[PDB]
Amino acid sequence: NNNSALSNVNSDIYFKLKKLEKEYELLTLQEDYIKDEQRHLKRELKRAQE
Amino acid sequence: TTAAPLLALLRENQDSVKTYALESINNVVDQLWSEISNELPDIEALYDDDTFSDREMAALIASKVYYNLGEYESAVKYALAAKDRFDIDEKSQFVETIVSKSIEMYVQEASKQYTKDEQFYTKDIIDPKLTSIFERMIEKCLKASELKLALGIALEGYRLDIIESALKSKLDQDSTSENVKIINYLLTLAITTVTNSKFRSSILRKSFDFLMNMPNCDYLTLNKVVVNLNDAGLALQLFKKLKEENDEGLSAQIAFDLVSSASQQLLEILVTELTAQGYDPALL
Amino acid sequence: LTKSLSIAFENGDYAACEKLLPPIKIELIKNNLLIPDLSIQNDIYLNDLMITKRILEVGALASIQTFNFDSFENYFNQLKPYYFSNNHKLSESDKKSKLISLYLLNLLSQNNTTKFHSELQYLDKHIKNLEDDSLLSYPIKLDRWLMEGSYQKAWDLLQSGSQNISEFDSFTDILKSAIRDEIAKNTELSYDFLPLSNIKALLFFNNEKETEKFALERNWPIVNSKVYFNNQSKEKADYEDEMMHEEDQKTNIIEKAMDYAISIEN
Amino acid sequence: MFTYSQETQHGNITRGLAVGLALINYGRQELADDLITKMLASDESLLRYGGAFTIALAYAGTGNNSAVKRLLHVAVSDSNDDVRRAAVIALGFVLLRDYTTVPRIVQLLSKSHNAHVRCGTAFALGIACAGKGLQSAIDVLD
Amino acid sequence: MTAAVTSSNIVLETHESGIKPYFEQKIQETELKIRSKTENVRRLEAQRNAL
Amino acid sequence: LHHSEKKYAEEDQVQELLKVLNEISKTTLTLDPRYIWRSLKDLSSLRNQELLNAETLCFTVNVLYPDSSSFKKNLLKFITSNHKSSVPGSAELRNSYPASFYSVNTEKKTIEVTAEINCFMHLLVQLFLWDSKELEQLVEFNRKVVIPNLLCYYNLRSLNLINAKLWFYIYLSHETLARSSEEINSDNQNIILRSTMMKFLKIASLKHDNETKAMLINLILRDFLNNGEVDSASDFISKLEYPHTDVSSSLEARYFFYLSKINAIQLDYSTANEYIIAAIRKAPHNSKSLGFLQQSNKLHCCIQLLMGDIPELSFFHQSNMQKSLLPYYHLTKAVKLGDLKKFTSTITKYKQLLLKDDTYQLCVRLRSNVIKTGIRIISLTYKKISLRDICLKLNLDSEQTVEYMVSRAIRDGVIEAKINHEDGFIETTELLNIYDSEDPQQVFDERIKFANQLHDEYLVSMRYPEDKKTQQNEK
């Protein structure tokens, strides 16, 4: 072995990552609301055929 | 083998026969758990008896069975009801899992009560034994000599008192520069992590006080804290320290960053309050 | 200590053995600590295991006669890993065949053939071949005669039980009442009324009066020497069939139309 | 400001006061929730328009999961062209903390048939990516 | 990669190794969401592109 | 000669090395690596044989060894000790390459990324021992080492894919030895073998990997079937943790075969049907797989018959498996005709074959089915026949015998008749219509739900390749 301060660097990832999951959770919001957009875009398709 | 004879031996009247039987189960509690799930109300019955003297192992055997099924919830509760058998859990590296869950369980309960009461870990609303395991995990982290794992865990369970005690023993004024970096790792953290209005405010406030206890600090650091809480009374205290420590250079440098970064509303109130301090018109 | 049980057994008192067996279970802890609990059996550990084995078999047999089902269950269980361990070290005794037959009789007499078939797949390897069938023959043929609904053979087996009589009698009494029960279950749906003499013949009694006594227990009215199931069968099924946990779940016609409906547009 | 908005039908006047209701709330965050709901539930276009901006100014400087769910609903749920615009602009302001999430959201909102939605996507990346340049953002605005 | 051939101060080294994937397990149950997310977001988005 | 063989083999191995190392060092790609490993392994075991049997050893020589040199030296020496530049670390052709393990880095023990590679090297070795049938000591030794070796790792998802395949050979070699010959040694290690799988299955739930989990459940259900412990298999089924999320089609197929066996011995037939059919469908229809299909097809006869539906005459007729299923065809014909004498004759003659496949225990129960069919036949033909005439025909003992078979048959409703003992005949009460019953409603529900199920399955699947071509540059 003969390496230390692997625990210093590994713990850095333990902080960053907690906040890095909040970011990608806004990207889970894209899935909820392309349901809304697509649902309403069936209605907008009835508008365009008029 | 099958563990069914050991369960049959539970039923016999002498205490001596049952205590030996429970120990035999423990050799193969995650390694032969199938029968024990089905005949589980017997082991619980032995816990509920107050004339049984190996209650503590009956609670453990049960705990383990619920861990194997997937049922984390009841495994934690039985953990605390053993009344010990926490020694076992340090000597088991394959099940520190339920130790982890005890943290989960604390942090959901802590966050719940935080909104309605300032403190609740002093009150008997949260169970003391569950609290004990929480603080124990934070020590384990520090046994590996990492402070980073310990502040992390502490934050969630809304413990200001642990956070202070942690910073304080690793502040000893080794250098002026070195005390600031840790605080700044924390200040930036509370802004981007804790979205809780009240708990974020307390943390920022304790970080002002540690540098305020020091006779020499980065004041640059302190300026961040002033602006985000947008509170004039903090700056008023900071200038008063500087009144009695004055330099033509030091004062001028803090003041130039400060009027740029500070908000318009904040600055109006502050110039009023510095007159009453008796501080120079040059600052104003 | 262990020799107290031994002399008690020969003498013919099985109450004496029963009550005296738990002080001996203190000495079965110590026995256990001598051996490695079947992670090796040498001739050093075989003489020590022989006592553990010897105490368990003979406790099993006393308990059946004194009707302690509870105690029986204890022995049953313990005995299993000792026979199971090795192909032969101490896995061979005559009492091995003896006990196997009794365990199985006990599974039939609860009237749950599920616990029987589970045991039967476990027995069919080493154990069954090694001891051969020579009292195993009995509980297996019986069970078979019950799948068939050939109670004439099943009832006959009890009688041939006399020849090996010791403590098979404590199960045979339980088995008769069950054999009679299975028939009564069948008779309801098969036909609806029968003369008194033909019911006697079927349910096995030597007197007409003992037939009407089983009638009253099974809640069936014989009047003018005729049984009736037109009332009774429908009554018993209804009280039982009344439940409020799967009777609000039947699956409506309305419900089925809706259920299809949403699958098409989603 | 809310009452005289309902009573007058004057076009210039009503616009001014719906915006003013949004202005006065800033840094409120989770204390703007009563005002936000009331305005987005008015049937007037003007009060819907400012409601989107009540979420923007209040929830500026701090990113929230909430603020985003509520403004995506607005663009889709209202067919009046100005209310659609207002909801896009508002995403920028909340999200100037992490401004490298912004192109990724509004990529979707630049595929829109409605030209107003597209027009607002411009201002959001404007607001987020003003102070420091970003190479991702240029690809959306192209 | 972690070692457990040698241990020192009565399994102190590997006590710490055991609790680091258990700290990160909290984060991995949240990543199982984001891993079905990748498939369903691309699924409805291509659906939105034909419309 | 010998030197030549080593270099030629080692080169071939380097190619394969490159492909897998790129995946794990570029972050997990999950489904993708499992696919790559199997294809490489088929190629490699076959290679191992030709050009010396030190092929495995060459790879170990030009790579870092946390513990891999020790195992390779044990194996070699056993199979006659040999020196030809075959003592690992002897030949150097890494030449300061990160890929082939940097020179400087190893000394310090700065790089320790051998672990996964180690799983794979062992993995080839287990399989080569099995093809050879030089399992024995070599296999037991690998097994020894590898248990503390996984517990020395605090595992990662890519490494779980590999150890899910190690675990396949580890169960099996114990079975192989025990299946030679009963040994006192075999007994001691069975109880051991059960314990370790159980223990590791709990850890592999938490790390969250499908392959390690599914595989372990399968090995343990099979362990239960040999020991006749149906109860331990039931509580095991009732655990519920068996996932469907990413599990291979090999693991599901085996999974359903076991399910069919477990239900049938404990007297449930209904639910065994669905699975015995499912298990044929997931398994592919190759010649190297033909054996597995012979097992399923034998089971399909018992399961189906006990539920009370006769399986296709046709299915067994028009196979190539017809000779294996020759005793079993004769079971089906006996039931069909209702002839008792026929069924008894069959199971006597072929008894040795039936015992191996473990269909025989199910056959004792299939006796019961023969008899009901014989009387079923008589009831359909003949509305009113005296029970006197029924006795003659099926050669039964008395008037009481004939009554008690027919009486049980009607509790389960299979004959559906009424016995008259005071009018001296059995009279069929058959309505025999189901078109003016609420029954068709219940059938059509299944058919419609299955159909919609498939419409969704088309819809979901369709998009994913479309998405990938879109990522790639094209016009």
One DSSP character per residue, B170-184 reads T-S-S-HHHHHHHHH
Give B189 to chain A, closest Cα distance, Å.
9
SS3 E48: helix
Measured between beta carbons, the chain C residues lying within 8 angstroms of B2 are 77, 80-81
As a whole number of angstroms, the distance between CA C102 and CA C168 comes to: 7
Which residues are registered as beta bridge partners of F419?
F426
The shortest CB-CB distance from F235 to any of B31, B38, B95 is to B38
Question: Is A15 within 8 Å of B149 when comparing Cβ atoms?
Answer: no
CA D125 to chain centre: 13
Give B5 to chain D, closest Cα distance, Å.
56
F282 burial level (CB within 10 Å; 0-12, 13-18, 19+): middle
As a whole number of angstroms, the distance between CA E4 and CA E15 comes to: 10
Give C28 to chain F, closest Cα distance, Å.
23
Q: Return the H-helix or E-strand segment holding F425.
A: strand F425-428
Q: Given CB atoms, is E46 within the 8 Å cutoff of chain B?
A: no
**Residue where the block lists tokens 């010396």:** F52
User: CA dihedral in degrees (F190, F195, F197, F200; nearest 10)?
Assistant: -160
Question: Is D73 within 8 Å of A37 when comparing Cβ atoms?
Answer: no
CA E9 to chain centre: 29
Question: Is A45 within 8 Å of E51 when comparing Cβ atoms?
Answer: yes
Which subunits sit against A, judged by 3+ Cβ pairs under 8 A? B, D, E, F
Which residues are registered as beta bridge partners of F418?
F427
Which subunits sit against D, judged by 3+ Cβ pairs under 8 A? A, B, E
Q: Which tokens in the block code for residue F255?
A: 């999974």
Q: Which tokens in the block code for residue F40?
A: 């490489």
Half-sphere exposure of C2 (CA within 13 A, CB side): 15
Q: What angle do CA C16, C18, C21 make, to 5 degrees?
A: 105
Cβ atoms within 10 Å of F439's Cβ, excluding its own: 10
Which residue in F has a C-alpha nearest to residue A2's C-alpha? F108
Cβ atoms within 10 Å of F63's Cβ, excluding its own: 22
As a whole number of angstroms, the distance between CA F343 and CA F366 comes to: 9
Q: How far is CA D23 from CA C15, D9, D12, D52, D58, in A?
A: 94, 21, 17, 12, 9
Q: How far is CA B158 from CA B120, B202, C163, D61, in A?
A: 10, 10, 79, 24
Q: How far is CA F360 from CA B276, C112, F354, in A?
A: 102, 22, 5
Give E22 to chain A, closest Cα distance, Å.
12
Which site among F110, F112, F152 would you substitute to test the E interface, given the most E Cβ atoms closer than 10 Å to its Cβ?
F152
Question: Is D64 within 8 Å of B192 when comparing Cβ atoms?
Answer: no
C158-189 exposure pattern, b = at least 16 Cβ within 10 A, e = fewer:
beebeeeeebbebbbeebeebbbebbbebbbb
> Helix F360-381 vs helix F399-411: angle between axes, to the nearest 10 degrees?
100
CA C90 to chain centre: 26
As a whole number of angstroms, the distance between CA D90 and CA F230 comes to: 64
Q: Which residues, including other chains, have CB under 8 Å from residue B10's CB and lie 6 or more apart? A: B18, B21, B22, B42, B43, B46
Measured between beta carbons, the chain E residues lying within 8 angstroms of F148 are 4-5
User: Does F contact C via 3+ CB–CB distances below 8 Å?
Assistant: yes
User: Does F contact D via 3+ CB–CB distances below 8 Å?
Assistant: no
B140 contacts B103 by C-beta, under 8 angstroms? no
Question: Is E44 within 8 Å of A35 when comparing Cβ atoms?
Answer: yes
Q: Given CB atoms, is A2 within the 8 Å cutoff of chain F?
A: yes
Q: Return the H-helix or E-strand segment holding B36.
A: helix B34-38
Which long-range contacts does C7-15 make (Cβ < 8 Å, 24+ apart)? C9/C58, C9/C62, C14/C61, C14/C62, C14/C63, C14/C65, C14/C66, C15/C66
**Residue where the block lists tokens 């985003």:** D68
Phi, psi torsion values for C226, nearest 5 degrees: -140, 130
Q: Which tokens in the block code for residue D35?
A: 């005002």
Cβ atoms within 10 Å of D107's Cβ, excluding its own: 14
Q: How far is CA C254 from CA C250, C251, C261, F434, F452, in A?
A: 11, 8, 11, 21, 19
Question: Is C80 within 8 Å of B2 when comparing Cβ atoms?
Answer: yes
CA F54 to chain centre: 32
User: CA dihedral in degrees (A11, A12, A15, A20; nearest 10)?
Assistant: -130
Question: Is E26 within 8 Å of B93 when comparing Cβ atoms?
Answer: no
The shortest CB-CB distance from B8 to any of C26, C38, C78 is to C78
Measured between beta carbons, the chain B residues lying within 8 angstroms of E22 are 96-97, 99-100
CA D21 to chain centre: 14
Instruction: Give the sign of the dihedral formed by CA B235, CA B238, CA B244, CA B245.
Output: negative
As a whole number of angstroms, the distance between CA B274 and CA B254 comes to: 16
As a whole number of angstroms, the distance between CA C126 and CA C137 comes to: 16
Q: Given CB atoms, is F266 within the 8 Å cutoff of chain C?
A: yes
Q: Which one-letter DSSP state was computed for residue F417? A: E
SS3 F134: coil
As a whole number of angstroms, the distance between CA C57 and CA F37 comes to: 55
User: Does B contact C via 3+ CB–CB distances below 8 Å?
Assistant: yes
The shortest CB-CB distance from E40 to any of A10, A18, A31 is to A31
Amino acid, single-letter form, for residue D38: K
Q: Which tokens in the block code for residue F284?
A: 């592919």
Which residues are registered as beta bridge partners of F426?
F385, F419
Q: Given CB atoms, is B40 within the 8 Å cutoff of chain F?
A: no
Cβ atoms within 10 Å of D140's Cβ, excluding its own: 20
Phi, psi torsion values for F420, nearest 5 degrees: -120, 120
As a whole number of angstroms, the distance between CA F188 and CA C85 comes to: 8
Which residue in B has a C-alpha nearest to residue E4's C-alpha? B93
Q: Given CB atoms, is B71 within the 8 Å cutoff of chain F?
A: no
Cβ atoms within 10 Å of F390's Cβ, excluding its own: 23
As a whole number of angstroms, the distance between CA C181 and CA B169 comes to: 80
**Nearest alpha-carbon partner for F169 in F223, F127, F217:** F127
Q: Where are the alpha helices (DSSP H) in F338-437?
A: 340-349, 351-357, 360-381, 387-394, 399-411
Give C27 to chain B, closest Cα distance, Å.
10
Q: Given CB atoms, is E19 within the 8 Å cutoff of chain B?
A: yes
Q: Return the H-helix or E-strand segment holding F385.
A: strand F384-385
Which subunits sit against F, judged by 3+ Cβ pairs under 8 A? A, B, C, E
Q: Which residues, including other chains, have CB under 8 Å from residue A30's CB and lie 6 or more apart? A: D105, D108, E41, E45
As a whole number of angstroms, the distance between CA B40 and CA B58 comes to: 10
Strand order in the sheet with F425-428: F384-385, F425-428, F417-420
Q: Which tokens in the block code for residue B223?
A: 């300026």
Q: Which one-letter DSSP state was computed for residue D108? A: G
The shortest CB-CB distance from C78 to any of B5, B16, B17 is to B5
Give E33 to chain B, closest Cα distance, Å.
19
